[PDB]
From a paper:
Genomic and biochemical analyses of the [name]-7 strain have revealed that the bacterium secretes at least seven chitinases, one of which is a unique high-molecular-mass (150 kDa) [name], termed [name]. This enzyme has three surface-layer homology (SLH) domains (~18 kDa); it is specifically expressed on the surface of the bacterial cell and degrades chitin. Based on comparative sequence analyses, [name] has two glycoside hydrolase family 18 (GH-18) [name] catalytic domains (~42 kDa each) and one carbohydrate-binding module family 54 (CBM-54) (~25 kDa), as classified in the Carbohydrate-Active enZYmes (CAZy) database. In this study, we have determined the crystal structure of the bacterial cell-surface enzyme [name] and demonstrated that this elaborate monomeric enzyme is composed of six distinct structural domains.
Thus, two truncated mutant proteins have been prepared to determine three-dimensional structures, i.e., [name]-SLHd (Val198 to Lys1418), lacking the signal peptide and SLH domains, and [name]-CD (Val557 to Lys1418), which is composed of the two catalytic domains. The two monomeric proteins exhibit very similar hydrolytic activities for chitin. Crystals of [name]-CD have been obtained and preliminary X-ray crystallographic analysis of the crystals has been reported. However, the crystal structure of [name]-CD could not be determined solely by the MR method using the Bacillus circulans WL-12 [name] A1 catalytic domain (BaChiA1CD) as a reference model (amino acid identity = 47% for the 1st catalytic domain and 45% for the 2nd catalytic domain); the electron densities except for the two catalytic domains remained obscure. In this study, we have used the automated model building software (Buccaneer), and the structure of [name]-CD was completely modeled by the program and the structure was refined at 2.03 Å resolution. In the catalytic region, the three-dimensional structure of Cat-1 closely resembled that of Cat-2, consistent with their high degree of amino acid sequence similarity (56% identity). Superimposition of the 355 residues of Cat-1 and Cat-2 gave a root-mean-square deviation (rmsd) of 1.0 Å and the surface models of the two clefts are similar. The two subdomains protrude from the core β/α-barrel and form the walls of a deep active cleft of approximately 42 Å in length and 26 Å in depth. In the solved structure, the two clefts cross each other at approximately right angles. The Ig-1 and Ig-2 domains might serve as linkers or scaffolds for the two catalytic domains.
Numbering used by the authors: 559 to 1416
The structure:
Amino acid sequence: GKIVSYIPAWVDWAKDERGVDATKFTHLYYAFGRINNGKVVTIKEDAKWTEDPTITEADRIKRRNNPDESNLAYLTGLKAKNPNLKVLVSIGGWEAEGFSDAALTPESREVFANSALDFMNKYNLDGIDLDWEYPVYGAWGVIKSRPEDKANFTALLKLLREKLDAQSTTTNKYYELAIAAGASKTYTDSVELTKITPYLDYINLMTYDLHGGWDPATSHHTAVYSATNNQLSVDSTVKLYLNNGVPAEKLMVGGAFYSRVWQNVENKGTGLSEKAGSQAGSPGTIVYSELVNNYINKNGYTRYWDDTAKAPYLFNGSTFISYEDTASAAYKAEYIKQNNLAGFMYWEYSQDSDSHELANTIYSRLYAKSGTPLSVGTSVYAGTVTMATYTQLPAGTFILPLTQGTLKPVISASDVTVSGIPAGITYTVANAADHRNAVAVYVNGGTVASNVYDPIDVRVVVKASAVLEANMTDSAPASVTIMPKFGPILLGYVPGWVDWTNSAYKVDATKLTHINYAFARIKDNKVVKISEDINWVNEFPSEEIREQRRNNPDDANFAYLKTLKQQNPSLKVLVSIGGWAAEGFSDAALTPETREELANSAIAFMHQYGFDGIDLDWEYPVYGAFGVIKSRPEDKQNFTALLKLFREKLDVEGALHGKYYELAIASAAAPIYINSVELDKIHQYLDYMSVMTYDYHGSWESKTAHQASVYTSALSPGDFSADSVLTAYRKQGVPASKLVIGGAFYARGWVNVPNINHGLFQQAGDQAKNPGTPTYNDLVKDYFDKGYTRYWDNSAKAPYLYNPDANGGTFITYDDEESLKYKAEYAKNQGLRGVMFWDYSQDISGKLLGAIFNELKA
């Protein structure tokens, strides 16, 4: 199943902020090469293009220096990311002149075709595509044309295939030849389809601009089916081509990442099949990204759907817009599959939304296995409604965009099951205003039956019935959050290896809600201070270190925390048992006796030193962090039993002490962790999981990336981010209100990083001179004004540093005030329990904590 993406020459692709994700298609067509004195040339050498009257001067100096060479290098560069990618040059396009002359004579055909190969070979291309629009009728006078174009097109294609084949017998590389073909009967009548088709790998059908403001009434411009007899469609065009004998296996169906517009449409019905007046004022087309930004269910435009054509359109009473969306793209991809066609071609990739929604939809739908219907998918845009008091819930609205599936323009109450809205609170569902494809759940203001001390998980199922596409199943239940009146948690790791009492830098209990004290440890299946952990105390041979570790200031720290809790009585201080390289959990978790023994010893430790709960930091079950710790496959279900039992023991303690003791874990981001821990079964025992949304990348790898980005960078599709990890957690079924997003107050980086794109996503050299983990404190002292410059990846919302001159080029990846703000903002919009960070000692300025606090609690 192929996917042809047309990519425009007139975007500077090396500069483009978002770049091209070539893992979502199979063929990249570079639009366009042009013809000039019978020869194929770069578009910058097409005077007709580089000096058009229409948008002129400021934007015409641009065109003269179009960066074609650089574009072609960047695009054929994308083979690193998709090795099976083919890149072809598309020659021609709308209004491109010179085919009729180029094809005229055996001689002019010879020089065109030789230059076509020369272009193909010069830029390392996999084939040639001819977009002659159109032979014989010349698009009715847009381009020069002659009645002999019909046979001359045949001879031209014959000659190209001969020469590509000749070259193939010598290089052993197969070369593609394709055309973009017109959808009209006039097109089929001006070319010899049966003669031509043996020369071509496939025929890209231009099944768009089928109708437009040149017609007296509105219609669909790129519809899958014909809803009336006079409306052209993908189906009517494919049937036309099959009837002329073109095999289904050589036809690609076209789609458009832009709309056709009609103005002055009579305001009747939905605007569809209505009479349209003057188009003189019309923009003609509006690209999909602009539709998303300013038109689809926005600014007075209503979204409508034609359930026969399988096509969306918009109308606001005067302007009608016909476009391609997620639902039409799915129906087109199902048409391709059901009719055995070659695939999906689209014009053109840069018109898509920033996050490549159409390109991504077409990939996902076209390589969906049949007989496995797809579930509707959700995300969250507004995930939190916050209690005003213990009983009073103000009005608010959960907003869940779909990521897979397309809501009907108006959904019904029965399309959505919401569970967990508290008793005596009414709600309704609907399509969220100002979003193209989102469920709103409006929660009526109200009074809850009993006091809300803890977050309420609200669970939203989007039924197969809510959606346009054909054979989909109900969504997984989407978690959002009713938050109790005190709002999100702000949790700090506080290291026990700092002597807090004699430190001039103190812990700010007015800004934290929670502290994890790092760490208690496990010895002989008993919980002990870190000073009794012989593996830690003697991690290093030097006695001066071991003596500092033997004298770890734990007692002093426990008195320090006791004071702090006396001064800030709503502060919760948990003891963290474990951490990096901490032993004993696999053994402790094994049997009911070993778990009993561990839980009772932990409980004893907790009471002895004045803690308000327990956090387990087992790093990590089953894989043992790749043999840093003892592990077993029984860890997976034994961790569940350990937490069940810790929770029971803590219930016993709170029932005896008239108080509530928290239980939490710190959990990792990587797929292997997620597959090692029964996340859907443990969350019930936990107040929250402190997800370590950092250490994604570092010196252990030979390429740079963001260690802690809140969003996945546009230029590293599929890469780790808080969003990607926390979404994976939610799809295991963890409620949002039991997730805590993590910030790191330390950096990772790479040395020997080349000075290309400021070191971001580059190959690095030998890492013996690597920074390791410089703290924000070290960045302030040694990096920030010392020849590193700070950059910002605005798609990832992640800062980074780069110094060309330090150890062969050094890239530093970290969290700062700005990224922490965005993590805190994600927590709030996603309905998460709150924010955590590691660790309090790493920023003595207070800025990083202040950044979180300012955003999160204000």
